Amino acid sequence: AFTELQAKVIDTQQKVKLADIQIEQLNRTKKHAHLTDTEIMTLVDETNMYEGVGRMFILQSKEAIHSQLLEKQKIAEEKIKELEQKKSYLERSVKEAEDNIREMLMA
Amino acid sequence: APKTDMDNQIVVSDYAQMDRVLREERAYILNLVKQIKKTGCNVLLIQKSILRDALSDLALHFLNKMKIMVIKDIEREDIEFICKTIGTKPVAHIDQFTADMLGSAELAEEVNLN
């Protein structure tokens, strides 16, 4: 029966679609969280520098920020691959049932 | 407090009115209770809530939350038996909250056991 063969190709279809759009900004928000560090690295030192996780800008030493923000680089730096790991298998998984659709038809 | 669709009086169109009429409803059932603890009661005889028109949990919450031990859901004829045999005089009203109409028990406990 091709129903679940048509059912699996629909679900894993929209599964893989997310890993493509996110991975690049994850490289960006990697690169930008390097840049925003370089952006505060622009002015050699300041107390009025802020890094924050919310509407609050909690006053922080840009140094600990350079760590935190290259850490924030490292945050989005990692998420590219776990998507690419998502991006890797899900592309094949949708065709798993599709491989079952067509062979049985070629059969 | 007065009913429409619950102990909370609800006029039904948009939800701020029924939210504000709470200020009406909430304060009363609090004060009506505050009035219950004014004269004060250690036990409250409360007959069944169908031997009531209805009993505000909103009150009844803050009622027992002013720390008065209560029995609800009791037969009024129990109460009638209780109004006589222990001489707890019938209280239909807060003027009727009085140390005479509020019966004096030597000890009042609950046993879930034996």
């Binding site: 894993t12 893989v16 776990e82 298998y89 049932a97 062979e103 049985m104 059969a107 | -």
Partner: protein, 192 residues
């Protein structure tokens, strides 16, 4: 189509019932017609099943956990050299796609008597331990699988039966009536 004249046995069981069209190749001679019987559903753990797909990497990791156990189940089928594989209910799309990776058609969600017909058609058994598989289990002998259009419908013939022969009555009427008149009296013989 056909006529009771050219109506004549093929070995095992000639499979009309679920066949309106080939689901099993077209014509298969040596390659084994194979019965996969339930127990092709995944195990996300070793013998176990853990939490299933939810978000990003579970789609990867879990549906992979589902796949290995079945790929492990898959191999034992391909190891006995099938091409057509008739899997009754209890199939994974995981179970087919490596059968697809070996380009060995895995025929899913088809009835029991039909598979028992097919278990009588090549006369193979029905797999009682789908985790450890044998060609002695399913696809016995050399076997045959032949899906033939005779009149309207493609008709799977799984033949060259092991189990003591086996043979089913080929019923070809011109109409189904001139078919049926024979079969009803045929029904006397086959009972006698």
């Amino acid at each position: 189509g056909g006529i009771i004249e050219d109506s004549c046995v093929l070995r095992g069981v000639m499979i009309n019932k679920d066949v309106t069209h080939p689901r099993m190749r077209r014509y298969i001679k040596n390659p084994r017609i194979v019965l996969l019987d339930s127990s092709l559903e995944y195990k996300k753990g070793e013998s176990q099943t853990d939490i299933e797909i939810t978000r990003e990497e579970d789609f990867t990791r879990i549906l992979q956990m589902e796949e290995e156990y079945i790929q492990q189940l898959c191999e034992d089928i391909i190891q006995l050299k099938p091409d057509v594989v008739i899997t009754e209910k209890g199939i994974s799309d995981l179970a087919q796609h490596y059968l697809m990776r070996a380009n060995i058609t895995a025929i899913r969600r088809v009835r029991k008597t039909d598979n028992n017909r097919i278990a009588r058609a090549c006369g193979a058994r029905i797999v009682s331990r789908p985790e450890e598989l044998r060609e002695d289990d399913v696809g016995t002998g050399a076997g045959l699988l032949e899906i033939k259009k005779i009149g309207d419908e493609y008709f799977t013939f799984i033949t060259d039966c092991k189990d003591p022969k086996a043979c089913t009555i080929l019923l070809r009427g011109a109409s189904k009536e001139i078919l049926s008149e024979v079969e009803r009296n045929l029904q006397d013989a086959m009972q006698v």
